[PDB]
Write a protein that binds this ligand. Structure first.
Ligand code: SAM
Ligand code: SAM
Lengths: 212, 213
């Protein structure tokens, strides 16, 4: 059984989690509005950066109070950031056996670095990037991470995959490769292995230790 | 002016991003995102979108006849067809910049083992097709990948949304839970501040992404 808490200034953005595993009760997902932990009438969560620069930075005081209430020493705190360590399939396998994930979603130019630093004195913290592009907020990264982790959780149960096919065997004058219709398991496995390695050298040569 | 059409068996998944578009951009005709239920193009009373894989094995494959009809209706010769897949070419910031000036994106969201390969192969004989991965992990469906792609592209279109790693950022208060903002940032020596930030970027990249060096 896993608990996932997501903290955000846009809780409505996390509604896509509800095409659930949540229904099966293996995981509980709760979404929290960061503005709940403010105290001023304007409920301000951001301020200009020290040292100059474009944009705004999320204030540490509000985040500190929220994480104080939600986290324990056993929590794995996940902080999405384009400057993070890479989130990969290996990471997903690792987090699939955790009891409690808390995902802190940033906006603007991100969260004051002292929030993560303070948290690390009490719990395990992971700052992670989901890919080499820039999003407007951490909410889409939270949805990606939750999906990748949940399909590996017990109870739900290298190379690029080659192409797949289904009926009919001929469509618009395009045929399913005849080996797949041949019923020869050894020949099919061999062909599928070759397609995978061929697609990998063309699209992701780095996976096989080549340039680019 | 960009049109984005998304085709999916879970249309409600895309509904946050539609509502995140500013009214001013929509009213000015800068952007229009539309979402379509794939089952609209099914042929049978059971609204079937998948079938068993040729050659055997576990899982299911999405049907070519259903997808072919959907893309026939939605795409034109000017369309850039985006097909998310963990076996695709990598989607990067460079890709996002390129797609930000397109007139028409269509995103085909897969499920299960993916879409019968003849769909993309056929489409590529009359339009541009791009099979892309958003990262080195496996998702259950293409919808989350569509959200990522739409966000990364549209924040580069003016008025819609919006090497080395960036270093840490700080704001008020100057002291918090025993931790002070680095004094250099409050110094008013802006050449020195820029050099400090550059070195912070270098250290963070060596630690977290040595591949970038
Ligand atoms: C415009 S980004 C920049 C802020 C970022 N934290 C930084 O320090 O560079 C705003 C937020 O979107 C999220 N984000 C953007 N790109 C991301 C990526 N590639 N991976 C994970 N999260 C990302 C993070 O939550 C981030 O704080
Ligand atoms: C379980 S995946 C595997 C299917 C995939 N098309 C294949 O043949 O390898 C099912 C669907 O989720 C989406 N998906 C999973 N991982 C993805 C990734 N890393 N990047 C983009 N889309 C992904 C794709 O739409 C894919 O068709």
């Amino acid at each position: 059984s896993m608990k996932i808490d997501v903290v955000t200034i846009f809780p409505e953005y996390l509604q896509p989690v509800r095409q659930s595993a949540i229904d099966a009760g293996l995981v509980d997902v709760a979404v929290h509005d960061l503005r709940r932990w403010t105290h001023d009438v304007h409920k301000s969560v951001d301020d200009s950066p020290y040292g100059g620069g474009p944009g705004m930075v999320m204030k540490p005081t509000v985040w500190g109070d929220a994480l104080d209430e939600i986290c324990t020493s056993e929590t794995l705190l996940v902080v999405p950031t384009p400057a993070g360590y890479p989130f990969t399939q290996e990471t997903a396998w690792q987090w699939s056996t955790e009891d409690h994930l808390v995902i802190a979603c940033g906006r603007y130019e991100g969260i004051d670095q002292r929030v993560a630093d303070d948290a690390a004195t009490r719990m395990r913290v992971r700052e992670v990037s989901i890919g080499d592009y820039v999003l407007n907020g951490g909410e889409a990264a939270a949805l990606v991470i939750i999906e990748a982790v949940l399909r590996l959780v017990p109870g739900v149960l290298s190379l690029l995959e080659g192409p797949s096919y289904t009926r009919p065997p001929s469509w618009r004058g395009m045929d399913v490769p005849p080996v797949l219709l041949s019923g020869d398991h050894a020949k099919i496995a061999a062909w599928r292995a070759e397609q995978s390695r061929q697609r990998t050298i063309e699209r992701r040569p780095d996976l096989l230790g080549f340039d680019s």
